[PDB]
Subunit: 230 residues, 3 copies
Amino acid sequence: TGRPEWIWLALGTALMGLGTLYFLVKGMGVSDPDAKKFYAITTLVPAIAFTMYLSMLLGYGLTMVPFGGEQNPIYWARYADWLFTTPLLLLDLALLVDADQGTILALVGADGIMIGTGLVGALTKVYSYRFVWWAISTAAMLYILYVLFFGFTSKAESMRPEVASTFKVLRNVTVVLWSAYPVVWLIGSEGAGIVPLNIETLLFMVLDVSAKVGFGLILLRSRAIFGEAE
Amino acid sequence: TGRPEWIWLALGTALMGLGTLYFLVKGMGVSDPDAKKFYAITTLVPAIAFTMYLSMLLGYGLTMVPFGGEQNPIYWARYADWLFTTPLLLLDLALLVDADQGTILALVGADGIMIGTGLVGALTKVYSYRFVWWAISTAAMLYILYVLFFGFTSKAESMRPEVASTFKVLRNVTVVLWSAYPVVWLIGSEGAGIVPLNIETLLFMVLDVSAKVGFGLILLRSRAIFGEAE
Amino acid sequence: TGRPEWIWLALGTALMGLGTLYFLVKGMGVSDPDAKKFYAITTLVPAIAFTMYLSMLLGYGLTMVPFGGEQNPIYWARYADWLFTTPLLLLDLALLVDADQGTILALVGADGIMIGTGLVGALTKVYSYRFVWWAISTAAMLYILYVLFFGFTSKAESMRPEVASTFKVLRNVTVVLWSAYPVVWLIGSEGAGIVPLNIETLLFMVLDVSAKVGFGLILLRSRAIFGEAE
Ligand SMILES: CC(C)CCC[C@@H](C)CCC[C@@H](C)CCC[C@@H](C)CCO[C@@H](CO)COCC[C@@H](C)CCC[C@H](C)CCC[C@@H](C)CCCC(C)C
Ligand SMILES: CC(C)CCC[C@@H](C)CCC[C@@H](C)CCC[C@@H](C)CCO[C@@H](CO)COCC[C@@H](C)CCC[C@H](C)CCC[C@@H](C)CCCC(C)C
Ligand SMILES: CC(C)CCC[C@@H](C)CCC[C@@H](C)CCC[C@@H](C)CCO[C@@H](CO)COCC[C@@H](C)CCC[C@H](C)CCC[C@@H](C)CCCC(C)C
Ligand SMILES: CC(C)CCC[C@@H](C)CCC[C@H](C)CCC[C@@H](C)CCO[C@@H](CO)COCC[C@H](C)CCC[C@@H](C)CCC[C@@H](C)CCCC(C)C
Ligand SMILES: CC(C)CCC[C@@H](C)CCC[C@H](C)CCC[C@@H](C)CCO[C@@H](CO)COCC[C@H](C)CCC[C@@H](C)CCC[C@@H](C)CCCC(C)C
Ligand SMILES: CC(C)CCC[C@@H](C)CCC[C@H](C)CCC[C@@H](C)CCO[C@@H](CO)COCC[C@H](C)CCC[C@@H](C)CCC[C@@H](C)CCCC(C)C
Ligand SMILES: *C/C=C(C)/C=C/C=C(C)/C=C/C1=C(C)CCCC1(C)C
Ligand SMILES: *C/C=C(C)/C=C/C=C(C)/C=C/C1=C(C)CCCC1(C)C
Ligand SMILES: *C/C=C(C)/C=C/C=C(C)/C=C/C1=C(C)CCCC1(C)C
């Protein structure tokens, strides 16, 4: 309770934990192989986030980085979360549209570059260089957003309407929520330091629960996750 | 030789190295694609363990963690081993039964959570919180054990008898040996400290060689690893 | 500019960045799923290397390792690069020949052992033991080279001539360039220290740009990356 942001770390831990349990129960019983892949992906995402929220809450996932002459509290565990959960979210989208394997590779690899350069920026001790990593990471994010909108152009032919509809909704959820993360980091504790860590943590908690549990609720309620069967 | 547990680290290095060489030789010549996947998986497992045993033996894979007011010797290299070798062992089981891809994802991701939360527990400086990570990791292990027993329920129909027989044996080997690891950690150097590090290292060496080389000997001697062919 | 090797780190950053941009543009428009996988793999390789070259240039990817009684500058970011880019290069080769999945596993796992034991050697504080890790890593490299020459022996039957021709060329490029890396490390800053870090960095920059951008130019100009189509 000693860090003011504890309350949002606690709330994020609880909501990710409850979302995980909900999705775990919800997928109990499903047999359809296509649906099993979406439940597995979609349940792992908040499970991983639960563990990394808890590590921040307990202090394990926090480190001090000197930059600006100051000792700056940097929650590194966010990058260990996102390293796994953001490619998993992209895989859910990619599987929905039956993406080609080359496209999945491009997406997962650009996402790794996005998170790994964000982690390098988050831990860089020369203040000005932190924003160079932010820019490179943002370029990788823009590439991902580009592929999500313009990289499935051969798939439209042979896409079930309900898959098309659930994919468009989740793609729009993804583009809006993910695009807010570079802005929060830029103005927050890792970047310019104009928004305090307390509020930054709240913002990422709202984004994360929305991008993982809210995304997952929309996907897992959809018929698009089942193969078409008589 | 300065740490009493060196002898078990040396013995573990040698047995993993010899098991690797044996499996490498044994799979020389196999053409069958199914069998090649099992030899590859099963040979990589003790090869990786050989390197991490050697890193503990040479001291690289040891760190001191303050907790309990004391400086506690924690062999972190075990988690770098298990991060790769325990999903590989699960993949051998999963391939045997032709598991659905969603099930393999669930298994590999729960296993990553199990090892990563065990690593966080192993390095946590607040003593009481180490057991919170142990509990979460144990929950993930129990999920894996649950899936190995109740998650292949559609596969029984179309399973060759020899695959069914080798899978049941290896599944039983896996459930018994893996379940001992949380107990050893709980009573050993990472947990309550009731069993000294010397004996703990012996216990994990016996478990590891059994779970990797003993498992691999049972699998690789089986006809279940070959596709059925005239 | 304070470290004499900065100029090769700068040149390597620029050439990897320009190679990435070139391959990104070059693959704009390709529809063929086979070709998309090769463009994705082959574009990610210099993109990742660009980020790790930049991290060395900016100092983030450098650490000091005590060994020999001295504080030795070790660029660890090379291992974070190679951890991802060397399996990706192997995947390009493997996909060219339609390798069996067991063979791809063997290659990617031996490559992980090669890079992870090279990283352990690079950070080991007992000088003599650094060469033990070098030897193990070299054994893994020799295994990979062995598989590239003798592990596709069932694939020769059903291999298009242009795939066979591009694969032989890239395989020869790979064996020659990769084999130089253990020699550079052995005589350079990480090993015996007979070649200064400045020259070592130049050597790895020439190898890396050749093994990634030069390799990629040969592959991506080939018809072998397209499925055979009327
Ligand atoms: C899915 C859910 C039930 C998760 C609920 C949210 C939760 C994890 C975080 C909320 C913290 C909350 C209790 C706030 C008040 C603090 C308080 C207790 C007293 C203050 O008092 C103080 C004074 O400084 C702090 O106490 C010590 C530390 C604790 C407060 C933190 C404990 C860790 C957690 C509560 C989480 C435990 C994880 C488990 C789910 C493990 C089981 C795994 C498995 C079976 C799948
Ligand atoms: C597959 C096998 C042959 C492995 C055999 C077991 C072994 C790796 C560990 C046993 C240690 C043992 C010799 C005990 C006595 C110590 C002693 C030498 C003297 C004591 O004297 C002392 C005094 O404190 C310590 O010596 C210095 C360190 C060494 C003892 C340790 C050296 C490392 C290893 C012996 C392993 C080397 C790895 C290789 C396989 C590399 C090749 C890779 C490739 C070709 C695939
Ligand atoms: C693809 C290319 C355009 C890459 C070009 C090469 C380059 C990255 C490295 C060359 C350094 C060079 C300018 C040498 C002179 C130094 C100098 C400026 C003055 C010396 O003056 C000094 C005194 O000590 C140092 O300056 C401070 C640091 C900088 C010199 C380094 C800045 C980082 C880089 C220049 C790279 C930026 C990365 C971007 C591509 C981000 C955008 C991502 C996205 C849109 C895809
Ligand atoms: C968020 C992101 C930036 C992260 C992206 C990925 C990331 C984790 C990068 C990792 C690269 C690298 C380790 C960097 C080190 C930095 C540093 C300063 C020191 C680190 O930290 C230290 C300091 O004490 C220890 O590291 C050395 C040991 C290793 C970390 C573990 C060794 C592993 C092996 C030798 C075993 C072989 C593994 C394989 C077989 C894997 C293949 C799987 C297969 C079987 C299919
Ligand atoms: C046992 C477990 C807990 C481990 C589970 C996974 C694990 C390794 C978690 C890693 C997350 C994270 C790095 C945590 C950092 C903690 C910390 C305090 C600081 C670390 O350690 C430090 C301290 O000096 C350095 O880290 C920063 C640099 C990075 C480690 C490496 C950067 C990688 C990239 C920028 C390149 C892009 C990579 C991708 C392209 C990968 C995608 C593959 C593709 C091409 C298909
Ligand atoms: C170049 C090579 C040697 C590297 C090869 C791989 C490598 C990165 C090895 C990593 C092992 C290990 C982390 C070693 C730690 C060393 C040390 C001294 C301390 C480190 O560094 C520290 C010091 O502060 C922090 O580490 C602990 C936290 C973790 C690093 C991150 C935890 C991750 C999780 C708990 C979440 C679960 C992840 C999974 C779900 C992944 C599965 C994917 C799925 C969903 C499909
Ligand atoms: C589950 C959490 C999700 C969906 C997180 C998304 C994170 C991002 C899109 C992060 C992007 C970043 C940048 C583009 C620039 C650097 C800072 C980051 C890593 C916050
Ligand atoms: C090759 C080595 C094998 C099979 C290792 C298995 C390791 C485990 C099943 C570890 C489990 C753990 C817990 C469930 C709780 C926390 C402590 C661990 C990581 C030892
Ligand atoms: C893109 C960069 C490439 C192709 C790098 C290749 C790196 C190697 C083949 C590294 C090999 C090493 C050894 C065999 C011994 C230990 C030192 C290393 C890691 C340099």
